[PDB]
């Protein structure tokens, strides 16, 4: 819509305040247009049709129950945008500034949250398995980082192709939560997932056994459930990324860490440069490698550090 740019202050799913932008139209909306072609909200009502109705509040302050989810979508997506465009030049996940629409309350206990290639959706969750989904930041731009593997590589969402597909979005997930400081983790989904169990997610990127998913390529998931495990074997990657960022030794194989920031950009070029539809495990090695040379030189520490990673978790 068209009106003034304003600035409201809410609460989010953790009862966390936390100021949003909002366009004044007679009622403030969420609409934010400070960030590319704007950040839109909209309240699915407990629909399944979408979007719903662009969200409008009688007085800026989002501090209802019902409100939570739509701060932390709004928020979080325009986190999400700062991240892609201050840290890799990316304007929103198309690359040209297009509008990042949000619906909040979709459908009833619906404990699941996605990007469906127009828009973010996110349900609200049971309230036993999940809260509502756009509390997590994590939740958030791994959603949005599909669309943004969507626009540039397409891989696959089957089999390794699919795993990396999931993984690429655990990684940038995960950097969104550190370059936002909420209050960051190598866990998905934890800020969101089962009220009633602290400490828990799902799933762990500095150590994916926890949960037991697959930490090396030996044991790697090869039925079919799951469009050929792409949320299990995708801790094999995020293994390797969590290594690349943090260091350690895994399986033996001593890993020099080279930061948070270094593996976001060897990941981010890997992905934009070097990934196709169909890349496997072991293409992905050899287009972080090819990117950490481009980007530190083929003698750097950056290239070792990449090698010892993979090494680690059994990908030539
Ligand atoms: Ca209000
Ligand atoms: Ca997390
Ligand atoms: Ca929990
Ligand atoms: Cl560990
Ligand atoms: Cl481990
Ligand atoms: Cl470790
Ligand atoms: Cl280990
Ligand atoms: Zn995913
Ligand atoms: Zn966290
Ligand atoms: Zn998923
Ligand atoms: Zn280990
Ligand atoms: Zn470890």
Do not use: C
């Given at each position: 819509?068209?009106?003034?740019?304003?600035?409201?202050?809410?609460?989010?799913?953790?009862?966390?305040?936390?100021?949003?932008?909002?366009?004044?139209?007679?009622?403030?909306?969420?609409?934010?247009?400070?960030r590319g072609?704007?950040?839109?909200?909209?309240?699915?009502?407990?629909?399944?049709?979408?979007?719903?109705?662009?969200?409008?509040?009688?007085?800026?302050?989002?501090?209802?129950?019902?409100?939570?989810?739509?701060?932390?979508?709004?928020?979080?997506?325009?986190?999400t945008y700062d991240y892609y465009k201050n840290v890799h030049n990316r304007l929103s996940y198309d690359g040209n500034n297009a509008?990042?629409?949000?619906?909040?309350?979709?459908?009833?206990?619906?404990?699941?949250?996605?990007?469906?290639?127009?828009?973010?959706?996110?349900?609200?969750?049971?309230?036993?398995?999940?809260?509502?989904?756009?509390?997590?930041?994590?939740?958030?731009?791994?959603?949005?980082?599909?669309?943004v593997?969507?626009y540039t590589?397409?891989?696959?969402?089957?089999?390794?192709?699919?795993?990396?597909?999931?993984?690429?979005?655990?990684?940038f997930?995960?950097l969104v939560?550190?370059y936002?400081?909420?209050?960051?983790?190598?866990?998905?989904?934890?800020?969101?997932?089962?009220?009633?169990?602290?400490?828990?997610?799902?799933?762990?990127?500095?150590?994916?056994?926890?949960?037991?998913?697959?930490?090396?390529?030996?044991?790697?998931?090869?039925?079919?459930?799951?469009?050929?495990?792409?949320?299990?074997?995708?801790?094999?990657?995020?293994?390797?990324?969590?290594?690349?960022?943090?260091?350690?030794?895994?399986?033996?194989?001593?890993?020099?860490?080279?930061?948070?920031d270094?593996?976001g950009k060897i990941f981010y070029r890997?992905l934009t440069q070097?990934?196709?539809?169909?890349?496997?495990?072991?293409?992905?090695?050899?287009?972080?490698?090819?990117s950490?040379?481009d980007l530190?030189?083929?003698?750097?520490?950056?290239?070792?550090?990449?090698?010892?990673?993979?090494?680690?978790?059994?990908?030539?």
């Amino acid at each position: 819509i068209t009106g003034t740019s304003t600035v409201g202050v809410g609460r989010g799913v953790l009862g966390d305040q936390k100021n949003i932008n909002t366009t004044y139209s007679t009622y403030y909306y969420l609409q934010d247009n400070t960030r590319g072609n704007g950040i839109f909200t909209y309240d699915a009502k407990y629909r399944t049709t979408l979007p719903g109705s662009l969200w409008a509040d009688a007085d800026n302050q989002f501090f209802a129950s019902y409100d939570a989810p739509a701060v932390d979508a709004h928020y979080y997506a325009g986190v999400t945008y700062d991240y892609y465009k201050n840290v890799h030049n990316r304007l929103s996940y198309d690359g040209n500034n297009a509008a990042i629409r949000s619906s909040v309350h979709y459908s009833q206990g619906y404990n699941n949250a996605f990007w469906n290639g127009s828009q973010m959706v996110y349900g609200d969750g049971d309230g036993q398995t999940f809260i509502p989904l756009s509390g997590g930041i994590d939740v958030v731009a791994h959603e949005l980082t599909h669309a943004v593997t969507d626009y540039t590589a397409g891989l696959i969402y089957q089999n390794e192709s699919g795993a990396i597909n999931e993984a690429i979005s655990d990684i940038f997930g995960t950097l969104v939560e550190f370059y936002a400081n909420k209050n960051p983790d190598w866990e998905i989904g934890e800020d969101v997932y089962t009220p009633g169990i602290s400490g828990d997610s799902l799933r762990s990127m500095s150590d994916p056994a926890k949960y037991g998913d697959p930490d090396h390529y030996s044991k790697r998931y090869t039925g079919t459930q799951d469009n050929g495990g792409v949320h299990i074997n995708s801790g094999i990657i995020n293994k390797a990324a969590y290594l690349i960022s943090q260091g350690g030794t895994h399986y033996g194989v001593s890993v020099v860490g080279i930061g948070r920031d270094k593996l976001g950009k060897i990941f981010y070029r890997a992905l934009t440069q070097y990934l196709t539809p169909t890349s496997n495990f072991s293409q992905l090695r050899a287009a972080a490698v090819q990117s950490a040379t481009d980007l530190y030189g083929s003698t750097s520490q950056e290239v070792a550090s990449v090698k010892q990673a993979f090494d680690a978790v059994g990908v030539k």
